[PDB]
């Protein structure tokens, strides 16, 4: 009862809003979006700001608010920061990836602001009895 908390399993499809699979071309080395999360199997990555000149920005079919589920077969679903950053930082200019991401969650509290264990509380969350 009182399920007013963010649901979790790994399921892209549990995730609400819009589930999209969009290709981001590794442009200018890496991507060009800042993403918060991916700390544990329990914590997924989420876009907190799309960096202008980023392939998300550019492709326009990915926006701040997409939650990063997986990418180019790689199970980045609950990927550890060190691991996810390793992939995302090592990529070359001119490459391609298929982003499996789910958007619909509006960016509420700033995950840009440290000094706290960052758990942003999202609206448009199910406040079910």
């Amino acid at each position: 009862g009182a399920m007013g908390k963010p649901f979790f399993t790994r399921n892209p499809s549990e995730l609400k809003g819009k589930f999209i699979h969009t290709k981001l071309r590794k442009s200018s080395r890496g991507f060009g979006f800042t993403v918060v999360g991916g700390d544990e199997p329990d914590e997924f990555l989420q876009i907190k700001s799309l960096v202008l000149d980023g392939p998300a920005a550019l492709d326009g079919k990915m926006e701040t608010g997409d939650v990063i589920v997986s990418v180019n077969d790689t199970c980045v679903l609950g990927h550890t920061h060190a691991q996810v950053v390793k992939i995302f930082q090592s990529i070359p200019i001119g490459a391609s990836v298929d982003l499996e991401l789910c958007r619909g969650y509006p960016l509420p509290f700033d995950p840009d602001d440290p000094n706290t264990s960052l758990v942003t509380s999202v609206a448009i969350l199910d406040k079910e009895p």
Partner: peptide, 11 residues
């Protein structure tokens, strides 16, 4: 120590 904190991965 802390677990629930989403990390800034600027890519």
């Amino acid at each position: 120590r802390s677990s629930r904190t989403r990390r800034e991965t600027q890519v």
